[PDB]
Write a protein that binds this ligand. Structure first.
Ligand SMILES: CC(=O)N[C@@H]1[C@@H](O)[C@H](O)[C@@H](CO)O[C@H]1O
Ligand SMILES: CC(=O)N[C@@H]1[C@@H](O)[C@H](O)[C@@H](CO)O[C@H]1O
Ligand SMILES: CC(=O)N[C@@H]1[C@@H](O)[C@H](O)[C@@H](CO)O[C@H]1O
Ligand SMILES: CC(=O)N[C@@H]1[C@@H](O)[C@H](O)[C@@H](CO)O[C@H]1O
Ligand SMILES: [Ca+2]
Ligand SMILES: [Ca+2]
Ligand SMILES: [Ca+2]
Ligand SMILES: [Ca+2]
Lengths: 340, 340
């Protein structure tokens, strides 16, 4: 039923909308034509290719006018708008997954459509993108009670009707959102960072997530530092960077189910210093949680040997100091963030 | 307020009663004389020696007729009897600890007394024994409400009266109980142990305790194996043994506060095979929990590299097989267990 996960941490791979289609019901046989104010269901049971297990997914979804996105009966997000997609992350069942979307047209005589890409990551480190298209099922009626549940049978539902393609539609191509926000996160450092500068040298930072009653699956990490950083998860090297204007994103497909420690060695070459990160963890029940760099991280000025292992004694580590919320001078708000 | 713990795992050190005294109230000025049916309080605030922090304690207590033992206001155990002591384990405050005992004489015209040794382990790996004696406070009356709480002031209480010594009393010297029971634990192995024998070779076993809402302090481990074992905690070597008739006991004074993994490499030289263990973990709120070898342990027949680290992927590990409860042939119930 389950597969061994041989996937290991890697550079984050953006889900793209380029191959996706806009879908609606076809109540107006003109694609992109005038549609009535209405809410409509869309469903697709997506099976895993034989020989591997699905682990988690990066989702980008756009809508005219609004949407609610469900995975295996669990509401994962609500959003609206076709100028920019919405990023969502979710843990998956190993062999099949039911994706369901309630799409909503809010404006009379206006076009209606939903578009999504679902980039599924498999237990062996491969991935595959699935899209909204005419293989999805819909109804010419409001979403029935529990339409998003696997217990609902859609075998007799009609096929969704394609309203347009990524590069040929009334909507034009939605821009991808950032993989994760840095808004809501903080530049942190050790407490020797004062008056807008820190000493030259390397500093370590640690954050543990341990929800012992849940099952963690995948993490996505967005990180940048002035001047540079090396990132570890459970003692394993994830990646390194040396830019405070271009952030790096990583996928961790092989989290421990209950206890995970993120550790950073960040180095200041002189002058202002800080490290900032946003981390989203997916859980097997469809929930998630976000961790940001803030004062709940532990920090130390002289880095000990083994600073990155998960179960070290954190005696003598201090609370990290918040230098500023994302946006403050001198770094500003212009960080280049990878697309979701 | 707190100290760095430089103590590391070691062979368990028995708390001994040899220097302890029996105490009561002195309502009968004859020590060991006739006493009335009554319940009486006994209290002692024990301070840590300057320069170090107390971490946890091994306690042995005996009574005529019965007792309830409190530490910093928390009830830690109830017991009775002077022929054999009762073993108790508890986490401690770093600089001072209030020990309180409600002693009970159940039989009219009979002697009355309580006796305890408190072997305190300090953050630097040293230890010191404290005993019941005339420095404890008591009352010639039933225990007041909340007498065991630090908020009760005993400054005007009279001194307890010594009823006898370990080697000179009406009771004679209480025998020390085993450090931990093996009764209640099971011999386990991998599932190739069938028909009373297992293949020659080494097998690994893992058990994790992760109460993410509590603070773990110390563990005491009792273990034996046919033919031999090596024991690890959080990847660090604790000890080894090669006897199935003489069990080994260990103290782990430096647990991680929330996540601890016990791992065993046990080896069969041929014939019957099994490993058995009992583990007690103390928590900072005065509570504890016991873990025994049972089918909740994970086991594997080909031991992988890194089998002992805490956060490994346990895919492919099986539930350990219960060979029998402690006492079954061929090993029987005669295991020599270290004294508490
Ligand atoms: C992954 C897969 O093939 N799942 C199918 C399931 O959808 C179906 O309901 C069942 C009927 O026996 O058979 C399973 O094998
Ligand atoms: C909700 C739903 O229909 N799930 C099905 C599952 O039962 C089977 C599998 C293989 O055919 O396909 C999907
Ligand atoms: C470990 C120790 O010395 N504790 C004492 C405490 O018992 C006393 O109530 C308090 C009064 O200021 O002073 C503290 O230092
Ligand atoms: C319950 C109680 O009396 N605790 C006291 C504490 O307040 C102080 C310390 C040092 O003198 O001694 C003990
Ligand atoms: Ca519309
Ligand atoms: Ca700098
Ligand atoms: Ca008595
Ligand atoms: Ca043997």
């Amino acid at each position: 039923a389950t597969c061994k996960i041989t996937a290991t941490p890697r550079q984050f791979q953006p889900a793209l909308l380029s191959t996706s289609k806009w879908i609606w019901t076809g109540e107006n046989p003109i694609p992109g034509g005038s549609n009535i104010i209405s809410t409509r269901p869309f469903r697709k049971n997506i099976t895993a290719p034989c020989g591997k297990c699905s682990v988690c997914a990066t989702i980008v979804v756009a809508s005219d006018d609004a949407h609610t996105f469900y995975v295996n009966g669990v509401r994962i997000g609500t959003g609206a708008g076709f100028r920019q997609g919405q990023a969502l992350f979710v843990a998956l069942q190993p062999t099949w997954n039911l994706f369901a979307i309630a799409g909503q047209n809010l404006v009379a005589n206006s076009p209606a459509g939903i578009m999504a890409s679902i980039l599924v990551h498999f237990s062996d480190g491969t991935s595959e993108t699935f899209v909204t298209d005419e293989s999805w099922k819909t109804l010419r009626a409001a979403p029935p009670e529990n339409f998003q549940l696997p217990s609902t049978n859609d075998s007799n539902w009609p096929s969704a009707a394609v309203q347009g393609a990524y590069q040929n539609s009334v909507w034009g191509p939605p821009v991808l959102p950032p993989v994760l926000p840095l808004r809501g996160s903080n530049w942190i450092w050790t407490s020797d960072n004062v008056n807008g500068a820190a000493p030259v040298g390397s500093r370590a930072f640690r954050k543990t997530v341990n929800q012992c009653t849940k099952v963690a699956v995948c993490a996505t990490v967005l990180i940048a530092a002035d001047d540079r950083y090396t990132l570890y998860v459970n003692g394993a090297t994830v990646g390194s960077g040396s830019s405070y204007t271009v952030a790096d994103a990583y996928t961790i497909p092989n989290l421990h189910p209950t206890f995970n420690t993120f550790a950073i060695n960040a180095t200041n070459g002189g002058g202002p210093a800080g490290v900032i990160a946003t981390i989203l963890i997916t859980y097997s029940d469809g929930s998630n949680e976000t961790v940001v760099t803030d004062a709940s991280w532990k920090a130390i000025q002289t880095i000990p040997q083994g600073f990155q292992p998960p179960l070290i004694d954190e005696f003598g580590w201090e609370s990290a100091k918040i230098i500023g919320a994302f946006g403050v001078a001198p770094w500003g708000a212009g960080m280049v963030i990878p697309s979701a």
